[PDB]
Short mmCIF file of N, CA and C (backbone and C1' of nucleotides) in Angstrom, two decimals:
data_model
loop_
_atom_site.label_atom_id
_atom_site.label_comp_id
_atom_site.label_asym_id
_atom_site.label_seq_id
_atom_site.Cartn_x
_atom_site.Cartn_y
_atom_site.Cartn_z
N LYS A 5 2.46 17.03 2.20
CA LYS A 5 2.60 16.04 2.92
C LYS A 5 3.59 14.45 1.07
N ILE A 6 4.37 14.23 1.58
CA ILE A 6 4.83 12.89 0.39
C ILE A 6 3.77 12.35 0.49
N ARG A 7 3.69 12.03 -1.07
CA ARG A 7 3.13 10.90 -1.55
C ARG A 7 3.75 9.31 -1.50
N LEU A 8 3.18 8.14 -0.97
CA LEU A 8 3.72 7.32 -0.88
C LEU A 8 4.53 6.61 -2.55
N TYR A 9 4.03 6.92 -3.46
CA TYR A 9 5.00 6.44 -4.49
C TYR A 9 6.29 7.33 -4.50
N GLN A 10 6.18 8.56 -4.18
CA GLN A 10 7.70 9.37 -4.06
C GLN A 10 8.36 8.78 -3.03
N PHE A 11 7.89 8.62 -1.90
CA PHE A 11 8.62 8.18 -0.80
C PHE A 11 9.42 6.85 -1.37
N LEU A 12 8.69 5.94 -1.50
CA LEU A 12 9.70 4.89 -2.51
C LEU A 12 10.24 5.01 -3.41
N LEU A 13 10.29 6.10 -4.13
CA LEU A 13 11.35 6.29 -5.31
C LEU A 13 12.36 6.86 -4.78
N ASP A 14 12.07 7.98 -3.63
CA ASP A 14 12.94 8.51 -2.91
C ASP A 14 14.08 7.19 -2.17
N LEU A 15 13.38 6.34 -1.71
CA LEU A 15 13.99 5.60 -1.15
C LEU A 15 15.20 4.42 -2.04
N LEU A 16 14.12 4.08 -2.93
CA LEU A 16 15.36 3.72 -4.11
C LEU A 16 16.38 4.42 -4.68
N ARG A 17 16.27 5.66 -5.17
CA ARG A 17 17.44 6.49 -5.22
C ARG A 17 18.34 6.67 -4.56
N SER A 18 17.88 6.80 -2.91
CA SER A 18 18.60 7.05 -2.10
C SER A 18 19.82 6.12 -1.34
N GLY A 19 19.24 4.38 -1.72
CA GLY A 19 19.80 3.73 -1.32
C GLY A 19 19.60 3.35 0.60
N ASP A 20 18.83 4.48 1.01
CA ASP A 20 18.68 3.84 2.61
C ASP A 20 18.28 2.71 2.87
N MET A 21 17.64 1.81 2.87
CA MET A 21 16.75 0.79 3.33
C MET A 21 16.95 -0.49 2.09
N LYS A 22 18.42 -0.63 1.81
CA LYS A 22 18.48 -1.76 0.52
C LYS A 22 18.45 -2.93 0.80
N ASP A 23 18.38 -2.91 2.37
CA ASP A 23 17.62 -4.39 2.59
C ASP A 23 16.46 -4.76 2.24
N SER A 24 15.46 -3.36 2.80
CA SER A 24 13.93 -3.52 2.34
C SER A 24 13.54 -3.46 1.10
N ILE A 25 14.16 -2.99 0.16
CA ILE A 25 13.54 -2.49 -1.31
C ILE A 25 14.52 -2.33 -2.00
N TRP A 26 14.72 -2.84 -3.34
CA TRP A 26 15.87 -2.72 -4.40
C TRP A 26 14.90 -3.21 -6.09
N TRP A 27 15.85 -2.11 -6.55
CA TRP A 27 15.46 -1.96 -7.93
C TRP A 27 15.74 -3.76 -8.50
N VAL A 28 14.34 -4.04 -9.33
CA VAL A 28 14.82 -5.33 -10.07
C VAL A 28 15.24 -4.89 -11.53
N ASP A 29 14.55 -3.62 -12.25
CA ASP A 29 15.32 -3.17 -13.41
C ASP A 29 15.05 -1.54 -13.26
N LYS A 30 15.71 -1.30 -13.02
CA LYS A 30 15.77 0.40 -12.90
C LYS A 30 15.15 1.20 -14.26
N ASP A 31 15.65 0.31 -15.44
CA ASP A 31 15.00 1.09 -16.66
C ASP A 31 13.69 1.06 -16.86
N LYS A 32 13.24 -0.21 -16.14
CA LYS A 32 11.77 -0.55 -16.61
C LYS A 32 10.80 0.28 -15.44
N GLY A 33 12.02 0.57 -14.37
CA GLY A 33 11.02 1.00 -13.03
C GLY A 33 10.40 0.01 -12.13
N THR A 34 10.98 -1.16 -12.14
CA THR A 34 10.03 -2.57 -11.60
C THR A 34 11.16 -2.49 -10.12
N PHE A 35 10.68 -2.79 -8.95
CA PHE A 35 11.29 -2.64 -7.92
C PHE A 35 10.93 -3.75 -7.19
N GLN A 36 11.21 -4.29 -6.45
CA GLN A 36 10.85 -5.40 -5.54
C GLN A 36 10.89 -5.36 -3.42
N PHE A 37 10.12 -5.64 -3.16
CA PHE A 37 10.15 -5.73 -1.34
C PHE A 37 10.74 -7.01 -0.95
N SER A 38 11.32 -6.61 -0.17
CA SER A 38 12.19 -7.69 0.74
C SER A 38 11.09 -8.66 1.93
N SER A 39 10.80 -10.01 1.44
CA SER A 39 9.97 -10.18 2.29
C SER A 39 10.06 -10.64 3.79
N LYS A 40 11.39 -10.56 3.95
CA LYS A 40 11.82 -10.25 5.38
C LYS A 40 12.05 -8.96 6.32
N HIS A 41 12.15 -8.11 5.77
CA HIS A 41 12.09 -6.72 6.08
C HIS A 41 11.56 -5.63 5.24
N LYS A 42 10.72 -5.93 4.86
CA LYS A 42 9.38 -5.06 4.24
C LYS A 42 8.74 -4.41 5.37
N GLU A 43 8.67 -4.94 6.62
CA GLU A 43 7.75 -4.41 7.84
C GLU A 43 8.26 -3.10 8.42
N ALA A 44 9.93 -2.89 8.23
CA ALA A 44 10.79 -1.93 9.01
C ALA A 44 10.53 -0.85 7.71
N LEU A 45 10.41 -0.90 6.72
CA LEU A 45 10.24 0.10 5.78
C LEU A 45 8.87 0.84 5.74
N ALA A 46 7.86 -0.21 5.95
CA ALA A 46 6.50 0.59 6.35
C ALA A 46 6.25 0.80 7.52
N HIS A 47 6.94 0.71 8.32
CA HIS A 47 6.93 1.54 9.69
C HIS A 47 7.34 2.74 9.69
N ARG A 48 8.43 3.21 8.79
CA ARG A 48 9.16 4.48 8.42
C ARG A 48 8.00 4.89 7.55
N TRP A 49 7.42 4.68 6.81
CA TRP A 49 6.24 5.17 6.27
C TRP A 49 5.35 6.05 6.63
N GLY A 50 4.46 5.12 7.81
CA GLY A 50 3.63 5.43 8.78
C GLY A 50 4.18 6.60 9.36
N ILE A 51 5.51 6.63 10.07
CA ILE A 51 6.48 7.62 10.97
C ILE A 51 6.13 8.96 9.97
N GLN A 52 6.72 8.64 9.21
CA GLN A 52 6.72 10.07 8.03
C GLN A 52 5.75 10.83 7.73
N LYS A 53 4.76 9.98 7.62
CA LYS A 53 3.12 10.36 7.65
C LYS A 53 2.50 11.17 8.83
N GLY A 54 3.46 10.50 9.54
CA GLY A 54 2.59 10.96 11.20
C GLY A 54 1.51 10.31 11.44
N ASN A 55 0.65 9.18 11.04
CA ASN A 55 -0.44 8.52 11.37
C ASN A 55 -0.13 8.23 12.51
N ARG A 56 -1.71 7.69 12.81
CA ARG A 56 -1.88 7.54 14.41
C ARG A 56 -1.71 5.59 14.70
N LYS A 57 -1.66 4.92 13.89
CA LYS A 57 -1.49 3.82 14.01
C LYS A 57 -0.22 3.47 13.13
N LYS A 58 0.41 2.49 14.32
CA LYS A 58 1.76 1.86 13.31
C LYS A 58 0.93 1.29 12.07
N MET A 59 1.96 1.65 10.82
CA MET A 59 2.07 1.18 9.64
C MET A 59 2.74 -0.30 9.36
N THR A 60 1.68 -0.95 8.90
CA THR A 60 2.06 -2.18 7.91
C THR A 60 2.32 -2.17 7.10
N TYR A 61 3.00 -3.70 6.26
CA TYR A 61 2.98 -3.47 5.07
C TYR A 61 1.52 -3.65 4.06
N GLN A 62 1.03 -4.79 4.64
CA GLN A 62 -0.23 -4.74 4.27
C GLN A 62 -1.18 -3.60 3.62
N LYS A 63 -0.92 -2.58 5.15
CA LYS A 63 -1.83 -1.37 4.79
C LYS A 63 -1.24 -0.48 3.77
N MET A 64 0.11 -0.40 4.06
CA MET A 64 0.78 0.10 2.63
C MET A 64 0.54 -0.14 1.20
N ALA A 65 0.79 -1.28 0.96
CA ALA A 65 0.17 -2.18 -0.14
C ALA A 65 -1.53 -1.98 -0.58
N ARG A 66 -2.27 -2.09 0.74
CA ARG A 66 -3.64 -1.38 0.12
C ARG A 66 -3.48 -0.20 -0.34
N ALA A 67 -2.79 1.00 0.08
CA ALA A 67 -2.36 1.84 -0.56
C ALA A 67 -1.79 1.86 -1.66
N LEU A 68 -0.86 1.04 -2.28
CA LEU A 68 -0.63 0.98 -3.75
C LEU A 68 -1.26 0.21 -4.26
N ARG A 69 -1.74 -0.31 -4.20
CA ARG A 69 -3.20 -0.66 -5.46
C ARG A 69 -3.96 0.36 -5.29
N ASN A 70 -4.27 1.07 -5.47
CA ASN A 70 -5.27 2.13 -5.36
C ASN A 70 -4.41 2.97 -6.64
N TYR A 71 -3.36 2.79 -6.96
CA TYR A 71 -2.42 3.43 -7.64
C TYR A 71 -2.59 2.85 -9.77
N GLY A 72 -3.37 1.54 -9.42
CA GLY A 72 -3.22 0.69 -10.16
C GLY A 72 -3.92 1.48 -11.31
N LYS A 73 -4.98 2.45 -11.54
CA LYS A 73 -5.95 2.41 -11.75
C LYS A 73 -6.07 4.05 -12.88
N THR A 74 -4.68 4.64 -12.18
CA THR A 74 -4.25 6.17 -12.90
C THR A 74 -2.46 5.57 -12.88
N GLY A 75 -2.30 4.85 -12.55
CA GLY A 75 -1.07 4.02 -13.33
C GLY A 75 0.40 4.78 -12.49
N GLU A 76 0.41 5.30 -11.36
CA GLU A 76 1.67 5.81 -11.36
C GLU A 76 2.71 4.55 -10.40
N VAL A 77 1.87 3.39 -10.18
CA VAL A 77 2.21 2.19 -9.70
C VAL A 77 1.62 0.97 -9.66
N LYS A 78 2.38 0.09 -10.66
CA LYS A 78 1.24 -1.14 -10.69
C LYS A 78 2.24 -2.30 -10.34
N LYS A 79 1.09 -3.09 -9.98
CA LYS A 79 1.56 -4.51 -9.31
C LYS A 79 2.05 -5.24 -10.81
N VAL A 80 3.50 -6.17 -10.61
CA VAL A 80 4.04 -7.05 -11.71
C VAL A 80 3.65 -8.57 -10.85
N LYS A 81 3.55 -9.35 -12.13
CA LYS A 81 2.96 -10.57 -11.64
C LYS A 81 4.83 -11.22 -11.05
N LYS A 82 4.90 -10.68 -10.40
CA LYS A 82 6.17 -11.37 -9.58
C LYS A 82 6.15 -11.03 -7.89
N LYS A 83 6.72 -12.10 -7.16
CA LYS A 83 6.61 -11.74 -5.87
C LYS A 83 7.12 -10.57 -5.32
N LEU A 84 6.15 -9.72 -4.78
CA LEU A 84 6.62 -8.62 -3.92
C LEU A 84 7.06 -7.50 -4.93
N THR A 85 6.34 -7.52 -6.11
CA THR A 85 7.28 -6.93 -7.21
C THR A 85 6.12 -5.85 -8.03
N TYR A 86 6.67 -4.60 -7.85
CA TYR A 86 6.10 -3.18 -8.80
C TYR A 86 6.50 -2.78 -9.86
N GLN A 87 5.56 -1.93 -10.55
CA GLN A 87 6.38 -1.09 -11.01
C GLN A 87 6.01 0.56 -11.31
N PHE A 88 6.84 1.40 -11.19
CA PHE A 88 6.37 3.02 -11.88
C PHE A 88 6.29 3.16 -13.23
N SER A 89 5.34 4.33 -13.42
CA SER A 89 4.99 4.50 -14.63
C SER A 89 5.95 5.31 -15.05
N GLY A 90 6.72 5.27 -16.42
CA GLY A 90 7.37 6.28 -17.18
C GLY A 90 7.43 7.93 -16.40
N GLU A 91 5.82 8.01 -16.60
CA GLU A 91 5.85 9.87 -16.17
C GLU A 91 6.41 9.91 -14.78
N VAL A 92 6.08 8.74 -13.65
CA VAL A 92 6.77 8.92 -12.19
C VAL A 92 7.94 9.08 -12.31
N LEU A 93 8.70 8.12 -13.17
CA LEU A 93 10.26 8.10 -13.28
C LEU A 93 10.86 9.18 -13.95
N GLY A 94 10.24 9.95 -15.08
CA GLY A 94 10.39 11.00 -15.22
C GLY A 94 10.78 12.51 -14.73
N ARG A 95 9.90 12.21 -13.52
CA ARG A 95 9.86 13.22 -12.14
C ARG A 95 10.62 12.88 -11.20
"O5'" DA B 1 -6.66 -25.22 10.74
"C5'" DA B 1 -6.26 -25.93 11.66
"C4'" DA B 1 -4.55 -26.51 12.14
"C3'" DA B 1 -4.16 -24.85 12.33
"O3'" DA B 1 -3.17 -25.12 13.38
"C1'" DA B 1 -2.75 -25.96 10.57
P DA B 2 -2.36 -23.83 14.15
"O5'" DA B 2 -1.31 -22.91 13.24
"C5'" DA B 2 0.28 -23.21 13.02
"C4'" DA B 2 1.04 -23.14 12.17
"C3'" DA B 2 0.54 -21.60 11.97
"O3'" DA B 2 2.40 -20.58 12.13
"C1'" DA B 2 0.75 -22.00 10.02
P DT B 3 2.38 -19.12 12.40
"O5'" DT B 3 2.79 -19.08 10.92
"C5'" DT B 3 3.53 -19.45 10.29
"C4'" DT B 3 3.84 -18.70 8.97
"C3'" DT B 3 3.49 -17.82 8.76
"O3'" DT B 3 5.01 -17.26 8.21
"C1'" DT B 3 2.32 -18.70 7.09
P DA B 4 4.67 -15.17 7.85
"O5'" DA B 4 4.53 -15.17 6.64
"C5'" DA B 4 4.46 -15.60 5.56
"C4'" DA B 4 3.90 -15.02 4.06
"C3'" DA B 4 3.40 -14.11 4.29
"O3'" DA B 4 3.73 -13.27 2.81
"C1'" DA B 4 1.51 -14.96 3.97
P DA B 5 4.21 -11.66 3.06
"O5'" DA B 5 3.92 -11.41 1.03
"C5'" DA B 5 4.31 -12.77 0.43
"C4'" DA B 5 3.16 -12.62 -0.73
"C3'" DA B 5 2.69 -11.44 -1.42
"O3'" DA B 5 2.94 -11.83 -3.01
"C1'" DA B 5 1.40 -12.60 -0.58
P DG B 6 2.47 -9.79 -3.87
"O5'" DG B 6 1.19 -9.95 -3.71
"C5'" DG B 6 0.79 -10.69 -4.66
"C4'" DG B 6 -0.54 -10.61 -4.87
"C3'" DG B 6 -1.27 -9.43 -4.89
"O3'" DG B 6 -1.87 -9.07 -6.26
"C1'" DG B 6 -2.74 -10.08 -3.37
P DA B 7 -2.61 -7.64 -6.45
"O5'" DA B 7 -4.17 -8.01 -5.85
"C5'" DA B 7 -4.96 -8.90 -6.18
"C4'" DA B 7 -6.41 -8.74 -5.31
"C3'" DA B 7 -6.80 -7.28 -5.25
"O3'" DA B 7 -7.58 -7.41 -6.57
"C1'" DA B 7 -7.11 -8.30 -3.16
P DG B 8 -8.17 -5.61 -6.83
"O5'" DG B 8 -9.59 -5.69 -5.67
"C5'" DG B 8 -10.57 -6.23 -5.35
"C4'" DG B 8 -11.36 -5.30 -4.64
"C3'" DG B 8 -11.66 -3.94 -4.29
"O3'" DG B 8 -13.18 -4.13 -3.88
"C1'" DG B 8 -10.95 -5.29 -2.59
P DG B 9 -13.89 -2.72 -4.80
"O5'" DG B 9 -15.19 -3.01 -3.48
"C5'" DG B 9 -15.91 -4.49 -3.47
"C4'" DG B 9 -16.28 -4.21 -1.98
"C3'" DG B 9 -16.89 -2.65 -1.62
"O3'" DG B 9 -17.79 -3.05 -1.02
"C1'" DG B 9 -15.12 -2.75 -0.02
P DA B 10 -19.32 -1.86 -0.65
"O5'" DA B 10 -19.04 -0.90 0.51
"C5'" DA B 10 -18.60 -1.84 1.97
"C4'" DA B 10 -18.55 -0.93 2.65
"C3'" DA B 10 -18.38 0.40 3.04
"O3'" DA B 10 -19.62 0.53 4.01
"C1'" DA B 10 -16.46 0.02 3.32
P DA B 11 -20.27 2.26 4.38
"O5'" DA B 11 -19.44 2.90 5.04
"C5'" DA B 11 -19.05 1.95 6.43
"C4'" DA B 11 -17.68 2.63 7.13
"C3'" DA B 11 -17.75 4.23 7.72
"O3'" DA B 11 -17.54 4.35 9.04
"C1'" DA B 11 -15.63 3.78 6.05
P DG B 12 -17.52 6.00 9.45
"O5'" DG B 12 -16.15 6.00 9.72
"C5'" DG B 12 -15.21 5.25 10.22
"C4'" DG B 12 -13.84 6.03 10.29
"C3'" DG B 12 -13.67 7.46 10.27
"O3'" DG B 12 -12.98 8.21 11.44
"C1'" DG B 12 -12.62 7.21 8.86
P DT B 13 -12.60 9.30 11.78
"O5'" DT B 13 -11.44 10.19 11.10
"C5'" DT B 13 -10.25 9.16 11.30
"C4'" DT B 13 -8.90 9.84 10.50
"C3'" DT B 13 -8.73 11.50 10.75
"O3'" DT B 13 -7.67 11.64 11.14
"C1'" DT B 13 -8.79 11.54 8.56
P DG B 14 -7.28 13.31 11.28
"O5'" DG B 14 -6.40 13.98 10.50
"C5'" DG B 14 -6.61 13.43 8.92
"C4'" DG B 14 -5.61 13.96 8.14
"C3'" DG B 14 -5.38 15.54 8.13
"O3'" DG B 14 -3.98 15.74 7.67
"C1'" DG B 14 -5.95 15.26 6.44
P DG B 15 -3.42 17.42 8.36
"O5'" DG B 15 -3.55 18.09 6.62
"C5'" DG B 15 -3.28 17.83 5.40
"C4'" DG B 15 -3.67 18.38 4.05
"C3'" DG B 15 -4.31 20.16 4.34
"O3'" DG B 15 -3.54 20.53 3.37
"C1'" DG B 15 -6.12 19.15 3.99
P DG B 16 -3.09 22.61 3.49
"O5'" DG B 16 -4.79 23.08 3.15
"C5'" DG B 16 -5.21 23.71 1.87
"C4'" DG B 16 -5.41 22.48 0.94
"C3'" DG B 16 -6.20 22.65 -0.59
"O3'" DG B 16 -5.74 21.61 -1.23
"C1'" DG B 16 -7.88 21.23 0.49
"O5'" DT C 1 -22.38 20.40 1.85
"C5'" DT C 1 -22.67 21.36 0.74
"C4'" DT C 1 -21.94 20.60 -0.38
"C3'" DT C 1 -21.34 19.58 -0.88
"O3'" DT C 1 -22.04 19.34 -2.13
"C1'" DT C 1 -19.44 20.81 -0.13
P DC C 2 -21.98 18.16 -3.04
"O5'" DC C 2 -20.59 17.49 -3.21
"C5'" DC C 2 -19.75 18.41 -3.99
"C4'" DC C 2 -18.25 17.71 -3.62
"C3'" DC C 2 -18.24 16.13 -3.16
"O3'" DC C 2 -17.31 15.66 -4.14
"C1'" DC C 2 -16.79 17.35 -1.77
P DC C 3 -17.22 14.39 -5.17
"O5'" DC C 3 -15.68 14.08 -5.58
"C5'" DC C 3 -15.20 15.31 -5.90
"C4'" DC C 3 -13.89 15.43 -5.59
"C3'" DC C 3 -12.82 14.35 -5.84
"O3'" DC C 3 -11.91 14.63 -6.53
"C1'" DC C 3 -12.63 15.42 -3.31
P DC C 4 -9.88 13.61 -6.26
"O5'" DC C 4 -9.38 13.87 -5.20
"C5'" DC C 4 -8.75 15.78 -5.58
"C4'" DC C 4 -7.65 15.23 -4.09
"C3'" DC C 4 -6.35 13.93 -4.54
"O3'" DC C 4 -5.53 14.74 -4.32
"C1'" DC C 4 -7.69 14.37 -2.14
P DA C 5 -3.99 14.03 -5.15
"O5'" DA C 5 -3.98 13.04 -3.85
"C5'" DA C 5 -3.23 13.36 -2.74
"C4'" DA C 5 -2.89 12.64 -1.29
"C3'" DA C 5 -2.53 10.97 -1.98
"O3'" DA C 5 -1.50 10.32 -0.88
"C1'" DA C 5 -4.91 11.00 -1.05
P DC C 6 -0.88 9.28 -1.98
"O5'" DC C 6 -1.72 7.66 -1.55
"C5'" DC C 6 -1.66 7.37 -0.66
"C4'" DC C 6 -2.32 7.77 0.92
"C3'" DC C 6 -2.57 6.47 1.82
"O3'" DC C 6 -1.61 7.22 3.43
"C1'" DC C 6 -4.40 7.67 1.77
P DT C 7 -0.88 6.27 4.05
"O5'" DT C 7 -2.32 6.12 4.81
"C5'" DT C 7 -2.60 7.12 5.83
"C4'" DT C 7 -3.85 6.50 6.80
"C3'" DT C 7 -3.73 5.26 7.68
"O3'" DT C 7 -3.66 4.96 8.92
"C1'" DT C 7 -5.53 4.57 6.32
P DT C 8 -3.63 4.57 10.31
"O5'" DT C 8 -4.91 3.41 10.32
"C5'" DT C 8 -6.01 4.04 10.87
"C4'" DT C 8 -7.01 3.02 10.53
"C3'" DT C 8 -6.52 1.43 11.38
"O3'" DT C 8 -7.62 1.55 12.19
"C1'" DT C 8 -7.81 1.59 8.80
P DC C 9 -7.69 -0.08 13.31
"O5'" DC C 9 -8.56 -0.73 12.34
"C5'" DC C 9 -10.18 -0.41 12.24
"C4'" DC C 9 -10.92 -1.46 11.24
"C3'" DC C 9 -10.48 -2.97 11.92
"O3'" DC C 9 -11.96 -3.71 12.29
"C1'" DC C 9 -10.77 -2.41 9.09
P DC C 10 -11.72 -5.30 12.91
"O5'" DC C 10 -12.19 -5.84 11.73
"C5'" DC C 10 -13.51 -5.32 11.03
"C4'" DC C 10 -13.68 -5.91 9.59
"C3'" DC C 10 -13.63 -7.66 9.67
"O3'" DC C 10 -14.74 -8.20 9.52
"C1'" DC C 10 -12.53 -6.55 7.82
P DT C 11 -15.01 -9.93 9.78
"O5'" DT C 11 -14.64 -10.16 8.59
"C5'" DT C 11 -15.58 -10.17 7.59
"C4'" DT C 11 -15.05 -10.33 6.11
"C3'" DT C 11 -14.73 -12.10 6.15
"O3'" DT C 11 -15.48 -12.82 4.90
"C1'" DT C 11 -13.04 -10.57 4.77
P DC C 12 -15.73 -13.91 4.68
"O5'" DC C 12 -15.22 -14.04 3.53
"C5'" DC C 12 -14.95 -13.12 1.84
"C4'" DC C 12 -14.16 -13.55 1.20
"C3'" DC C 12 -14.12 -14.93 1.09
"O3'" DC C 12 -14.13 -15.39 -0.54
"C1'" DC C 12 -11.79 -13.94 0.90
P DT C 13 -14.03 -16.31 -1.24
"O5'" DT C 13 -12.61 -16.27 -1.74
"C5'" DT C 13 -12.20 -15.38 -2.68
"C4'" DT C 13 -10.76 -15.69 -3.09
"C3'" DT C 13 -10.59 -17.29 -3.57
"O3'" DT C 13 -9.87 -17.24 -4.88
"C1'" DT C 13 -8.83 -16.33 -1.87
P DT C 14 -9.11 -18.68 -5.82
"O5'" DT C 14 -8.31 -18.79 -5.31
"C5'" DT C 14 -7.13 -18.00 -5.84
"C4'" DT C 14 -5.79 -17.78 -5.27
"C3'" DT C 14 -4.99 -19.72 -5.68
"O3'" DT C 14 -3.84 -19.14 -6.73
"C1'" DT C 14 -4.77 -18.76 -3.26
P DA C 15 -3.00 -20.42 -7.14
"O5'" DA C 15 -2.10 -20.95 -6.13
"C5'" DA C 15 -1.44 -19.60 -5.66
"C4'" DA C 15 0.05 -20.18 -5.00
"C3'" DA C 15 0.36 -21.36 -4.85
"O3'" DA C 15 1.72 -21.02 -4.04
"C1'" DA C 15 -0.39 -20.68 -2.71
#
DNA sequence: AATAAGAGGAAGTGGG
DNA sequence: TCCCACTTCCTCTTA
């Protein structure tokens, strides 16, 4: 099963949900969710995973925060903004 | 108040 | 057995 950080990185590369997520500075790996359209992206994540319940942005971000310690994704001090690690971007 | 981002402890589910 | 990689639920904090 695809990992959440890879799902997001793939969306950013493909441009498929450009109204829900976008790069802020792709060289730095910073990206930002849409305040008004992030829920559609969260729904897609849960359906891709086959989860029992409908996925929400809140639950998806709960998972995102767990990457802070290992470093794949870190929260940036800007609204709805996160940052991939150099290791994630290189792969 | 209404809305909402950001947070995390705790327990549940998958597939090793 | 017991960790993976989240998911689900609940409650709190700040703006």
